[PDB]
Structure 1
Amino acid sequence: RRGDRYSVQTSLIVATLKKMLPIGLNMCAPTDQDLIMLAKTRYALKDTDEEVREFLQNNLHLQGKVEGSPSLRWQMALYRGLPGREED
């Protein structure tokens, strides 16, 4: 039909990442989403993997606050509610 021959929306390489996304973001703590959002901006600034890693080294303290965002309170209570989450 529209994209039977080929279509970007049906590309399997990106589709597998779409399916695999919940597990990938499962590792990261949502308090670090400030680092996540700033990460795309510095990626768009043409910054490579090593220099964004040392950007994270310089900005290890820039995580979010659970108290000031009540949406994070229940999310973090369920996050440590997961048996596989160790505080270390």
Structure 2
Amino acid sequence: KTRYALKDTDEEVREFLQNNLHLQGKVEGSPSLRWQMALYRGLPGREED
């Protein structure tokens, strides 16, 4: 969203779709990030490994 706001189009998004890799931070980095990971992992209706 901020890239789109900073004068970018769909071509730039496609080119930079795999540029970022460090965004997948550890689950212990925040006191509430464990809850989000737990709900995203351990639910029958939400399975994404």
SS of corresponding position for 1:74: helix
CA contact under 8 A between 2:27 and 2:34: conserved in structure 1?
yes
Root-mean-square deviation (CA, aligned residues, Å) is: 1.9
Shift of 1:84: 2.5
Structure 2: distance between partners of 1:86 and 1:50: 31
Please say which structure displays the higher CA radius of gyration: 1
Shift of 1:71: 0.6
Structure 2 CA distance for partners of 1:65 and 1:53, relative to 1, 3 Å: farther
Number of aligned residues: 49
More helix by share: 1
Structure 2 CA distance for partners of 1:62 and 1:54, relative to 1, 3 Å: farther
Residue segments in structure 2 that go unaligned for 5+ positions in a row: none
Runs of 4+ residues over 3 Å off in structure 1: none
Q: Larger RCO: Structure 1 or Structure 2 (Cα < 8 Å, ≥ 6 residues apart)? A: 1
TM-score, structure 1 as length reference = 0.44
Residue segments in structure 1 that go unaligned for 5+ positions in a row: 1-39
TM-score, structure 2 as length reference = 0.66
